[PDB]
Ligand binder design. Sequence first.
Ligand SMILES: Nc1nc2c(ncn2[C@@H]2O[C@H](COS(=O)(=O)NC(=O)CCc3c[nH]c4ccccc34)[C@@H](O)[C@H]2O)c2nccn12
Lengths: 115, 112
Amino acid sequence: RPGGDTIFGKIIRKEIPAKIIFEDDRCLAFHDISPQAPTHFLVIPKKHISQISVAEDDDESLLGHLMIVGKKCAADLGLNKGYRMVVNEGSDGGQSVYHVHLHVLGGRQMHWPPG
Amino acid sequence: GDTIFGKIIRKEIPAKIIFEDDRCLAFHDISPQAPTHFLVIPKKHISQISVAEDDDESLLGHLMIVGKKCAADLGLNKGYRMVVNEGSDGGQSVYHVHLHVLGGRQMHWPPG
Ligand SMILES: Nc1nc2c(ncn2[C@@H]2O[C@H](COS(=O)(=O)NC(=O)CCc3c[nH]c4ccccc34)[C@@H](O)[C@H]2O)c2nccn12
């Protein structure tokens, strides 16, 4: 079982259903089950990294790829007034699932501060 | 940069710089929304994430790695939140790509 047994590791292996927007060899984009905006989806790596604080220097282009796929998917979903990308780390960040992920939120005016 | 962040990169106006290399700059935000609130920006003028190019991928990744290393250095051991805003709905305040890093308090949900 590559990808770990977080919920996200099981989504990667098609063991748990999700609404997938995009998939390649490096990552998977899918709609969030508790959306905080009219559009709210996640971009995750297939490589299991628990959290951004433990990402390796060599994980640089993978993290970049999450953001490139994020902005491409946002455009494909017609978020043409903009969006907010979020990564949460640890307890103060509110991280609930310990597999690195990028949130993309849009379809309404996002406020400041960002929580 | 024909933005204020351009002026910061060119060292034309003050900012409290945390880290610099050949391709990015990290500095404390002038209007902080947490006890720690800093930015990591590329030196290359990418106006917004929507127009980033495919071969900017390792650079964008570099911002996040530099951000997580600065976070650790600044003592954000209980965690943090990273944010990139795009466009008017996103609340993007400067048309030069920037990664926010906020910590030192509980960050809430939703994220704005
Ligand atoms: N599609 C789908 N999505 C799922 C499933 N399980 C979890 N998610 C999604 O993963 C995200 C984790 O982000 S995160 O920062 O780790 N977790 C958070 O929960 C951050 C937000 C948060 C919650 N309470 C807080 C309190 C303070 C600050 C932030 C928060 C959340 O937005 C979840 O809704 C699931 N199972 C089958 C299909 N599924």
